[PDB]
Curated annotation (Swiss-Prot):
Quaternary assembly: Part of the 30S ribosomal subunit. Forms a tight complex with proteins uS10 and uS14. With proteins uS4 and uS5 encircles the mRNA as it enters the ribosome, which may play a role in mRNA helicase processivity. Some nascent polypeptide chains are able to cross-link to this protein in situ. In collided ribosomes contacts ribosome rescue factor SmrB.
Coiled-coil positions: none
Organism: Escherichia coli (strain K12)
InterPro entries on file: KH_dom, KH_dom-like_a/b, KH_dom_type_2, KH_sf_prok-type, Ribosomal_S3_C_sf, Ribosomal_uS3_bac-typ, Ribosomal_uS3_C, Ribosomal_uS3_CS
UniProt-recorded name of the protein: Small ribosomal subunit protein uS3
Cited function: Binds the lower part of the 30S subunit head. Binds mRNA in the 70S ribosome, positioning it for translation. Plays a role in mRNA unwinding by the ribosome, possibly by forming part of a processivity clamp.
Keyword tags: Ribonucleoprotein, Ribosomal protein, RNA-binding, rRNA-binding
Pfam family of the protein (one): Ribosomal_S3_C
GO cellular component, one term: cytosol
Length: 206
RNA sequence: AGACCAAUGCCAUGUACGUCGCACUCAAUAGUCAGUUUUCUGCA
């Protein structure tokens, strides 16, 4: 087990943080756990909506949750009853007056959360993994994407030993720190157990 | 160059490699008949 998380080593360099509140030591743990609850809830209740990121920020006793998603229409719905329902329950969880926004992730096959969730969904619909991976690399390289690597792992095809079998195309410069590597990871709970899907997407060199 | 260095339970090893798709709507040509009599009308 030996590679650094390629989001974490780029946190001040190119990648931003998904939480951008300041807090002293008295409320740092409380704000942090409140963020675990709103991302847990808001991740479970938008499983069909293809959600990429949820960014929390707290401007002066009020949360401001931004849902980067690929299907904004299914998040908002017929006149946005679903949004006001979500800020009602996020205001229930965080205990502050909640705002909520939706940022449309166009080009959803270049986002690693959406790619890993895609391949994970296909693996738990019992399709063969080489199609899922290989289709994901092809259609991601089709639109921009100066590199992509996907990597499934663990008891693939229902075996009794676990393999990995990664694929990559293009250039994925993972030790370069100015590389805009969009990396994310999902787990596929199949009837044989968990299958881990990692995906790195190299977008640009700065 | 050219001292000395002995041995290393029992098994089965594997899953596993067989491939795809697209579409679409605009125009001619119902019905309308007739219209007193003439005439100067700048000039070189």
């Amino acid at each position: 087990g030996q590679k650094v998380h390629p989001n974490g080593i780029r946190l001040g360099i190119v990648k931003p943080w998904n939480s951008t509140w300041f807090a002293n030591t008295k409320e740092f743990a409380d704000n942090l756990d409140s963020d675990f609850k709103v991302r847990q809830y808001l991740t479970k209740e938008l499983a069909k909506a293809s959600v990429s990121r949820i960014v929390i920020e707290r401007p002066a006793k009020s949360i401001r949750v931004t849902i980067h998603t690929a299907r904004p229409g299914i998040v908002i719905g017929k006149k946005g009853e679903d949004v006001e329902k979500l800020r009602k329950v996020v205001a229930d969880i965080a205990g502050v007056p909640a705002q909520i926004n939706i940022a449309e992730v166009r080009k959803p096959e270049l986002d690693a959360k959406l790619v890993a969730d895609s391949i994970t969904s296909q693996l738990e619909r019992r399709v063969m993994f080489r199609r899922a991976m290989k289709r994901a690399v092809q259609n991601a390289m089709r639109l921009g994407a100066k590199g992509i690597k996907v990597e499934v792992s663990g008891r693939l095809g229902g075996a009794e030993i676990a393999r990995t079998e990664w694929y990559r195309e293009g250039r994925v410069p993972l030790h370069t720190l100015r590389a805009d590597i969009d990396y994310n990871t999902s787990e596929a709970h199949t009837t044989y157990g968990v299958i881990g899907v990692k995906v790195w997407i190299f977008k640009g060199e700065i």
